[PDB]
Ligand SMILES: [Mg+2]
């Protein structure tokens with residue numbers, strides 16, 4: 001026990017002071033989330049989307065990238081909201097194989113630059129985000145990268161809708177392969193487009209592979225936390241495909257592998273790696289809620 | 291620059307994971323805050339008390355004592371709420387020199403064990419907290435200590451009400467001497483009664499002197515953040531008595547002196563000192579909001 005420090009108040013003060021500054025940062029970010037729910041209240045019903053949910057969202061993006069101002073976090077926050085609006089339109093609103101695919105097609109069209117249909121709130125919010133990226137981009141030729149993340153996420157949403165209505169569930173491995181429907185990579189790439197530079201662009205392929213590794217971690221941590229809810233709605237959950245012991249051991253090992261990659265990656269992408277490490281850290285700790 | 295570490299993702303993950311666990315802890319604490327606002331809605335009007343305010347409160351107590359469960363933070367949270375209910379009844383509701391003093395007398399009476407009057411919501415909430423302390427106390431003879439903090443806080447509320455209606459303002463020094471009206475020491479002592487032990491009791495005098503030192507820091511940091519609001523309501527504010535430069539230099543030096551005391555104090559009160567250091571850290575960082 002003598003190797004364990006006797007004094008902790010000094011570091012205690014310093015850590016708590018940064019946690020307090022980030023909580024105020026998150027409160028400032030919550031203001032744009034409210035603005036967004038307001039412009040499109042049809043996407044954000046109350047029974048799910050209340051200021052409690054908006055608070056948790058703003059706390060996550062502030063604690064994931066605490067070096068950003070609230071204005072710099074605008075995109076990450078609205079993209080995160082857009083993912084939850086799109087999830088809802090697909091999981092709850094859609095009632096047909098045809099309904100889901102027209103949503104997907106309409107979003108892809110907007111992501112590719114088409115004007116949103118006037119009756120399509122989901123498409124109008126995406127078009128707003130896309131135009132924010134166009135004005136805010138720190139580098140050119142961001143469009144192919146962003147459209148690809150849109151495509152990957154929407155395609156995976158299709159596959160999950162099919163699984164919920166299919167005769168046989170996917171394997172655990174196949175399910176984890178489908179984690180783009182979580183939307184984390186979509187959010188990360190949106191964030192990096194407005195906050196990165198030319199250096200960011202030349203490292204985008206590696207950054208996106210790391211982002212997809214973190215997203216698999218987030219899917220496992222999400223599902224371990226949401227098992228009861230998922231059971232309740234017939235939604236797919238990793239713990240239906242393997243047991244909690246395998247999910248937890250795999251979470252542990254994936255985290256340790258991912259941090260080894262981030263350790264290498266930070267030599268070239270210090271800000272990028274940090275963003276991902278804090279995204280994996282905050283989200284797994286928050287979802288676990290120990 | 292080579293002395294500055296190249297690698298930050300690993301520590302980034304670990305810090306973010308604890309921040310995420312504490313944010314979930316805070317969300318669990320918010321549930322008792324809601325329960326309390328509900329039982330006494332007459333004390334907690336909406337124009338001030340919304341879930342935004344409750345969220346900030348729960349985040350502060352969770353980040354100040356992250357080793358506590360939500361159940362262990364119940365008292366600290368309800369005592370904090372009680373201070374804001376009492377502030378409101380005094381600042382807004384009371385309209386007379388007589389009104390303020392009967393509030394004070396009624397609260398002191400409940401703190402000393404009297405039954406609250408059936409028409410007195412403020413007194414009923416205090417009686418609930420007092421009874422929670424009685425059942426939850428980690429040591430005997432807590433009552434004289436707690437009643438003294440009640441008395442100090444209420445007496446200072448009287449003095450501030452008089453200053454707002456007096457011909458001459460206090461000096462800066464006298465104002466800072468009156469910081470018990472902030473309620474931080476009241477909250478800390480309530481917290482320590484239910485979470486401390488016999489060891490805590492024998493160190494209470496020193497712990498309370500340290501608590502009062504942190505409270506002066508909190509008053510300065512509060513006032514630097516609330517200057518505009520205070521100007522708006524004619525409420526007293528340290529920046530009316532000295533200039534921002536002196537308040538800021540004094541905040542800096544008081545913090546450094548207080549952490550020197552906490553450094554000594556932690557040898558005997560490790561958990562106590564930590565609580566105070568994190569209270570000073572979180573609150574000054576949150577109020578500053580850089
Ligand atoms: Mg979904």
Ligand SMILES: [Mg+2]
Nearest residue numbers: 087181182183
């Ligand atoms: Mg999803």
Ligand SMILES: [Mg+2]
Nearest residue numbers: 222226229230
């Ligand atoms: Mg879920």
Ligand SMILES: [Mg+2]
Nearest residue numbers: 377378380381
């Ligand atoms: Mg007051």
Ligand SMILES: [Mg+2]
Nearest residue numbers: 377471472473
């Ligand atoms: Mg006060």
Ligand SMILES: [Mg+2]
Nearest residue numbers: 512516519520
């Ligand atoms: Mg104030």
